[PDB]
Amino acid sequence: WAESLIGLHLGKVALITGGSAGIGGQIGRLLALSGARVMLAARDRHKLEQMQAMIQSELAEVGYTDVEDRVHIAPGCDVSSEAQLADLVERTLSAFGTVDYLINNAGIAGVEEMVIDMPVEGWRHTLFANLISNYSLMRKLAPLMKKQGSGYILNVSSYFGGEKDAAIPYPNRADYAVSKAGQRAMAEVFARFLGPEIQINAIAPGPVEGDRLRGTGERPGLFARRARLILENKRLNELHAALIAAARTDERSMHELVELLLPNDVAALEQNPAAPTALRELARRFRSEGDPAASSSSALLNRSIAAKLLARLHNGGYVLPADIFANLPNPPDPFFTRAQIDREARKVRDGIMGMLYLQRMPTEFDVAMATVYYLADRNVSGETFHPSGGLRYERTPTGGELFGLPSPERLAELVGSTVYLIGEHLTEHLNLLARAYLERYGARQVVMIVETETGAETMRRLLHDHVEAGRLMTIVAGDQIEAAIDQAITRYGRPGPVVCTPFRPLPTVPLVGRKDSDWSTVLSEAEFAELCEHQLTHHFRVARKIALSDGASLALVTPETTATSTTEQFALANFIKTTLHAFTATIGVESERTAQRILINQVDLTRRARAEEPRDPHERQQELERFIEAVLLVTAPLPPADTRYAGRIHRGRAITV
Amino acid sequence: WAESLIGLHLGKVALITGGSAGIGGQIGRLLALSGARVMLAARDRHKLEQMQAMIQSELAEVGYTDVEDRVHIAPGCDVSSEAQLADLVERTLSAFGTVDYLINNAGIAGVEEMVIDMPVEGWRHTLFANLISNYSLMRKLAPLMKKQGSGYILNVSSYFGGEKDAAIPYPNRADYAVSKAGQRAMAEVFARFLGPEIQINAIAPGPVEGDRLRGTGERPGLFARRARLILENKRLNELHAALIAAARTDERSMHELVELLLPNDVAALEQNPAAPTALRELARRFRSEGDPAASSSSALLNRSIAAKLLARLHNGGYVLPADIFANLPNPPDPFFTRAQIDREARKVRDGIMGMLYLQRMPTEFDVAMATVYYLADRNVSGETFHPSGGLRYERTPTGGELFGLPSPERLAELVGSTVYLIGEHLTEHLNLLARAYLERYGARQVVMIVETETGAETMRRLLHDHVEAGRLMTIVAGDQIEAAIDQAITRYGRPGPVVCTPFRPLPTVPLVGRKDSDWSTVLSEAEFAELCEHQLTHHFRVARKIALSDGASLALVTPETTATSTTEQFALANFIKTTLHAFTATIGVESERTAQRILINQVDLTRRARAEEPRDPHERQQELERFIEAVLLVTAPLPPADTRYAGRIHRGRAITV
Numbered sequence A, B: 001w002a003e004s005l006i007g008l009h010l011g012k013v014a015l016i017t018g019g020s021a022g023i024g025g026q027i028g029r030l031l032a033l034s035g036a037r038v039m040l041a042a043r044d045r046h047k048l049e050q051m052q053a054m055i056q057s058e059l060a061e062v063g064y065t066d067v068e069d070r071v072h073i074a075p076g077c078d079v080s081s082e083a084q085l086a087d088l089v090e091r092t093l094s095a096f097g098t099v100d101y102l103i104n105n106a107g108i109a110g111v112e113e114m115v116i117d118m119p120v121e122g123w124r125h126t127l128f129a130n131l132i133s134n135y136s137l138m139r140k141l142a143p144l145m146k147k148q149g150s151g152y153i154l155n156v157s158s159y160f161g162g163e164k165d166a167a168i169p170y171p172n173r174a175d176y177a178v179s180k181a182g183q184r185a186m187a188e189v190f191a192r193f194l195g196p197e198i199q200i201n202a203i204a205p206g207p208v209e210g211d212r213l214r215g216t217g218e219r220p221g222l223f224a225r226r227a228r229l230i231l232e233n234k235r236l237n238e239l240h241a242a243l244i245a246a247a248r249t250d251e252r253s254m255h256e257l258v259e260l261l262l263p264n265d266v267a268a269l270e271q272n273p274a275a276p277t278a279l280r281e282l283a284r285r286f287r288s289e290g291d292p293a294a295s296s297s298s299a300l301l302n303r304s305i306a307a308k309l310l311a312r313l314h315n316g317g318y319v320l321p322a323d324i325f326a327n328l329p330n331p332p333d334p335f336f337t338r339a340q341i342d343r344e345a346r347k348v349r350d351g352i353m354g355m356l357y358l359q360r361m362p363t364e365f366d367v368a369m370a371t372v373y374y375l376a377d378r379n380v381s382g383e384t385f386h387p388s389g390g391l392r393y394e395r396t397p398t399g400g401e402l403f404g405l406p407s408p409e410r411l412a413e414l415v416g417s418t419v420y421l422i423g424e425h426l427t428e429h430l431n432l433l434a435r436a437y438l439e440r441y442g443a444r445q446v447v448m449i450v451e452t453e454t455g456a457e458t459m460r461r462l463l464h465d466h467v468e469a470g471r472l473m474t475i476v477a478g479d480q481i482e483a484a485i486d487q488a489i490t491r492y493g494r495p496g497p498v499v500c501t502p503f504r505p506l507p508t509v510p511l512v513g514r515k516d517s518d519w520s521t522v523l524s525e526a527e528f529a530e531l532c533e534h535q536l537t538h539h540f541r542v543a544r545k546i547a548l549s550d551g552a553s554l555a556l557v558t559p560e561t562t563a564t565s566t567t568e569q570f571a572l573a574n575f576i577k578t579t580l581h582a583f584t585a586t587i588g589v590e591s592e593r594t595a596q597r598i599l600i601n602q603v604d605l606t607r608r609a610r611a612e613e614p615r616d617p618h619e620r621q622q623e624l625e626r627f628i629e630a631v632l633l634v635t636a637p638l639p640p641a642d643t644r645y646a647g648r649i650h651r652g653r654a655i656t657v
């Protein structure tokens, strides 16, 4: 079977992160069999030593000599640590000299929670491990590849990272999906800069068979575990959606509404004539859709769900004592029966298996073999190769640019609304949006949330008339956007429409260095992490907070490109646009599937090419009016027109101005 | 170099169309070296005999014996002929038994004209050779592959066939682009039906180095030839656009306007105070942008351009004597100078080369090698592999579904307009559109162009009130849509907005047969050709005619899918939607680049999945209103808002209802 492989990559040096097991371990193995000298990097020394010994033994069997010189290991390497990545590159260059192939394979599953239950630090950790690490290693190795006149960067993405003009929603995995999309977008935008010397591509396998305790989660894996979590999350979502909806139209505070749940009795809540209709209807559903042997059919929640529900409420700025659930009656085991858990387990498994046109799961070996043959192709760059595929799954096309205003019925919903606008750099866009909502569509007030005092003063001077009239309020957020939103909620009330623009402009630094330069001026590893903080994490933090705070709609706005933006700014803007589409699509589907009201969509001020941009003041006026129209199209709330069909249309989409 | 290849496909039987030269010849060569028995099909016997001898000689050199049994040829096989495809399959099965790999490689360049200069029979020929032939061979070979439990269909598409959610405009190549997109769409929609036994994928290489006299045109090729044609076409486009525009706002007939060109004197036309401003301004441009040594700077046209211009005018229903240009003064050679031709030649070459990130053209051998390694992958189906790529080129994202109505300024342009509606099956959509234009937006009249008398009577009964009032006229087109449009032009006047819906519904027949069946009920080769005639050729014929007839806008409407459409209807609808997007994007760019006024866009009534469809009368009412909004968004003309920026936005787009 190895006949076709031996000699294919003779003379090459390859660095494989996550190289002791899974797909990475097989790519390392097969590259070594093909003749490459390999460095395997991962955290655990023992697993690396086992893999190294297995590969060296196989190399000796096929005839290689001095096998200790062909397979090296780099233990204690966690790709989320910049210092560990710097050490890995020094160790690899010391062992083998210049790296020919950088195989950016290591990937972690991430937080595995809905955005509204996702810690911000958890999101950041996934980006550091899965995405920022890929830029970091490219930044350290590409100078030597360019100098020698050849190199290859391969980012191991996922089918769930999407494709060129479409996002793929991956509910409960937004951090992961964004990291995967970012890996592909990095190949797409850097290819022109890295060429002709260096190829950069991504692989996007679908689910791959492997160790049930490991992997990034595309494969079925652990069933009873995945199922029980799904059932616990479903109970949390149903309770949270009913309490949020009840609070919106009931005179009682969230504290008073949560007090209705304290007897923890489903039948008593359904039968309570004074309980809000959303809670009584929910209790009816728990009794009907429930297994009579499961205590979840007679009890509303348990201590674990209650704590996670309380965390959502506190994070949404609702006021409740921390000990509100201290005396909650504990429901008897089983909360969910074995039958319920096994039914959900079969649903998870069959769902994944049912996507496959070929009705067979590829192996890690199969995926690695297709990848190692693909590496021999010298005529591809900026591509995403699918070593496995043939999947039936939902897709969200991105980049539509032909649109108009929403219906007068949708625009009528804006009268007397509380609008939040977030931004700093885009003063023209912010001024025009505040004026459109206040002057044209009768919003009651606009809360302008900026980053700095200088930004606040600039907006206050631009909107002096609305400031004086008490229609425009300004808040300075700094790096504490969630606390700034809590200030807005307490002082000015909860938002209806929200528009989120980035605080910062894109940097103007080179993306590659000259062949004989030290690359000292090129976008640094720290600067790439800052780009992700300002252009991706910013939107995630706002979306998480606004959804938790019962915002009606949210428009995520990407950076602006113009006819005079630098070529590097166009590349970075397109990297952000593609990567954020993964977030928008995923959170849109999460929201829709969990009966959350919020409509979340993306409005792009970034275009693929300079030639598409306005060239004169007339075309610029047309562009700014298109921006206002795009934002109103995604922020005007659906009138009580609110169907399942209309609901799916108005969430997780991206439109280009 | 062959070490990695020998044995990879041992025991396989492969059929390669266009197998005597180019990419196909190399795929045949490398599959044979890898151990497959190959059948090479093409038209010329001599080139097939040369290729067969070269491959057999190379097989003997590497150690194969009885090489005459491993490489067979099938001369006189033109893939555009159904009878020749039937003979090819009988010859291959007689030689080798069951085919394992069907390599649908043969492709012709096609007409190589703008849509408005493209003969309808030429378009049909390209579809037969490049697309219908692929279905035909799959239909003949898949029953035996399913029976044996394995098979592979590979369609050789092009980067210019587009990708999953994006079309790629290919001006002057619409027939070719549609055929290439259709090959990819066939892999995308048939994969679920052909699985698990059969894999179906496409390859989409970018430009490939080859014989300058051959190939499908992605590579630079012949320069002085490509350039002189571009210059001749540019003169034709500029003259045609100026005459069409002048005729629209001048009291003189097209005959009288063309008489201004008969002295064939640029300076005299510019200096004529009675000549329309569009013609005087054009003559000024010919004098300024022209080479003084070129007779095209002092003469408007030559006999060749004049005949092609007269053909456009006659095909647009303008009345002119066939001998109008019989006495045209012949301009002295050179009409275009060597300097002008060489400048354009360098532009063509540099344009193609400048797209490549790797600044190197892949060879046929390189592309075939990557393809033969890819064929070993058993875990992919419905995919498009790019064996070469890394290209900078324009892309048109498709499938946007969040939109609203156009501006009141655009809708005001519809008052007193002449609307043409084309269709038959979609009576509800046709009735609602005629009523929207007449009752809501004050169109003067609607011309309803149907296929049959029964269709006409159905529409006349649905629209009885507008029929009686003389606001709704009905014409029966049959299979003569162009003559039907000429009747509408003569009797009712030239159209402003035009909506083109398919006359026919999609068929309800199986797309695959049972393993042990004869497949007698499965979609036949003739039925697949009929599907292309009714769902692709229909729109091309209407777009070609309407653009030539000075229509203001055109909406191409795809088939309707509902919550109750069969699974085969969903597959066929999606095949059409993807394939027609290639046409819409290409003609939109052709029109924009040649200063044609017409706005051409696509409105899709097809969705990817059943779960997205309306489920009740309320959601169905929402869907039909969305259809009207989509059509008005693409058909309301741009008010004298008509800029270069707005122009590019409003052409070649596709929106999903």
Ligand SMILES: NC(=O)c1ccc[n+]([C@@H]2O[C@H](COP(=O)([O-])OP(=O)(O)OC[C@H]3O[C@@H](n4cnc5c(N)ncnc54)[C@H](OP(=O)(O)O)[C@@H]3O)[C@@H](O)[C@H]2O)c1
Pocket: A017, A018, A019, A020, A021, A022, A023, A024, A025, A041, A042, A043, A044, A045, A047, A077, A078, A079, A080, A104, A105, A106, A107, A108, A129, A156, A157, A158, A159, A204, A205, A206, A207, A208, A209, A210, A214, A215, A216, A217, A218, A219
């Ligand atoms: N599994 C799938 O079905 C699938 C599908 C599509 C794409 N992918 C992608 O394929 C890649 C590999 O996935 P996998 O399923 O093989 O993963 P895996 O089974 O979890 O891990 C394989 C290797 O990664 C190492 N690793 C884990 N976390 C690490 C970290 N923080 N830093 C460094 N090394 C780390 C492990 O060693 P240590 O634990 O000792 O560090 C081991 O060597 C990922 O990028 C993933 O997104 C996977």
Ligand SMILES: NC(=O)c1ccc[n+]([C@@H]2O[C@H](COP(=O)([O-])OP(=O)(O)OC[C@H]3O[C@@H](n4cnc5c(N)ncnc54)[C@H](OP(=O)(O)O)[C@@H]3O)[C@@H](O)[C@H]2O)c1
Pocket: B017, B018, B019, B020, B021, B022, B023, B024, B025, B041, B042, B043, B044, B045, B047, B077, B078, B079, B080, B104, B105, B106, B107, B108, B129, B156, B157, B158, B159, B204, B205, B206, B207, B208, B209, B210, B214, B215, B216, B217, B218, B219
């Ligand atoms: N050339 C490129 O840069 C490029 C790029 C992307 C995709 N492609 C695709 O690659 C495929 C092969 O293209 P190519 O450039 O190799 O083409 P090519 O050079 O024109 O032709 C190669 C072979 O096709 C045969 N052939 C031509 N017309 C035929 C017909 N009507 N019926 C049967 N055989 C026919 C030729 O033999 P006879 O003339 O004797 O029949 C010869 O064997 C096509 O599908 C094309 O669309 C090409």
Ligand SMILES: [Mg+2]
Pocket: A560, A561, A562, A563, A605, A613, A614, A623
């Ligand atoms: Mg711009």
Ligand SMILES: [Mg+2]
Pocket: B560, B561, B562, B563, B605, B613, B614, B623
């Ligand atoms: Mg429908």
